[PDB]
């Protein structure tokens, strides 16, 4: 079938592009957690490290490049171009209690102890908790001027379609990745709290 994972990825990319364009065209990153964007850039770097190694397709290599370039550009806009609007005093999450336990968890709990599997397991675990600095920022201030409704919609459609993908592959193909599913549920629950804080604190 492979329709839910594709539309899920395209919805994920749309969210990334919307945020990058929002920061660029509004000339501000007010309300954005630079630490979460740094974690997302690290997710794509560790997952797509076999970019120039391992050529499979031109859609495959270019899409990996699009995600990396957009994630690095968003980090560039937050910490270099429009750093005057970066609320560092509110982006106070100590990401050491994320990277270090996620790193230890990837060495402990994985499907196979090999450098490529550990690296993939790291990026899976990290992506599930990468939004935490953003969550703690909005919970602290009640604000997210740069976070738009369409940005959150495509993030939510990305999580919903991945959920459909898990169910479809399990029932029709017998496939299930317990690590990816458990981490994906954690990520989806965290995104729902992300959506809950924005609707309750930022909107009204």
């Amino acid at each position: 079938m492979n329709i839910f994972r594709l539309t899920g990825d395209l919805s994920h990319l749309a969210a990334i592009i919307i945020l990058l364009l929002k920061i660029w065209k509004s000339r501000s990153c007010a309300g954005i957690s630079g630490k979460s964007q740094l974690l997302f850039a690290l997710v794509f770097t560790t997952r797509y490290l076999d970019l120039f190694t391992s050529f499979i397709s031109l859609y495959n290599t270019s899409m990996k490049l699009i995600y990396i370039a957009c994630s690095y550009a968003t980090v560039y806009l937050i910490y270099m171009k429009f750093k005057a609007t970066y609320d560092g005093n509110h982006d106070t999450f100590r990401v050491e209690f994320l990277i270090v336990p996620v790193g230890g968890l990837s060495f402990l709990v994985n499907h196979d102890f090999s450098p490529l599997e550990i690296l993939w397991t790291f990026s899976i675990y990290l992506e599930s908790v990468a939004i935490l600095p953003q969550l703690f920022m909005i919970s602290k201030t009640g604000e997210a001027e740069t976070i738009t409704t369409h940005y959150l919609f495509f993030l939510g459609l990305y999580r919903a379609l991945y959920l459909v993908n898990w169910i479809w592959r399990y029932y029709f193909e017998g496939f299930f990745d317990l690590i990816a599913v458990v981490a994906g549920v954690v990520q989806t629950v965290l995104y729902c709290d992300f959506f809950y804080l924005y609707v309750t604190k930022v909107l009204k």
Partner: nanobody, 121 residues
Framework: QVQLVESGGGLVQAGGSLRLSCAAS????????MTWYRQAPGKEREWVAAIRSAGHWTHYADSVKGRFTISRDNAKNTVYLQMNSLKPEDTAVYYC??????????????WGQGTQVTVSA
């Protein structure tokens, strides 16, 4: 990009055993999954057994649990399906399917030609 060849099928008695093999050829990817399907005459295709490129994870359809065994052999680019205590309902054309588990690889999805398995009553 990848060609798959299945062998090991044929005719066997009820209660007999057969081992299918899926030989992979072409250019590999680092993380993949391989699934056995079967399509009995007049029925829809259904998954039978599933395996990944590494780890101890396996999965078997309800109707073949306890009777079938899927296993790996990376030294040969081969995955086996051991089918023990075969019943006439297992008569079908069996297909192996390899999928790239990496991101953005929606069409790295390849199928064998199929092998006939018939179980006499």
């Amino acid at each position: 990009q990848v060609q798959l060849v299945e062998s090991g099928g044929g005719l066997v008695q009820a209660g007999g055993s057969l081992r299918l093999s899926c030989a992979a050829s072409g250019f590999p990817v680092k993380r993949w999954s391989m699934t056995w399907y079967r399509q009995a005459p007049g029925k829809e295709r259904e998954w039978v057994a599933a395996i990944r490129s590494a780890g101890h994870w396996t999965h078997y359809a309800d109707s073949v649990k306890g009777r079938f065994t899927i296993s790996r052999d990376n030294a040969k680019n081969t995955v086996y399906l051991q089918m023990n205590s075969l019943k006439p309902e297992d008569t079908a054309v069996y297909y192996c399917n390899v999928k790239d588990e990496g991101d953005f690889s929606y069409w790295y999805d390849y199928w064998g030609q199929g092998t006939q398995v018939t179980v006499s009553a």
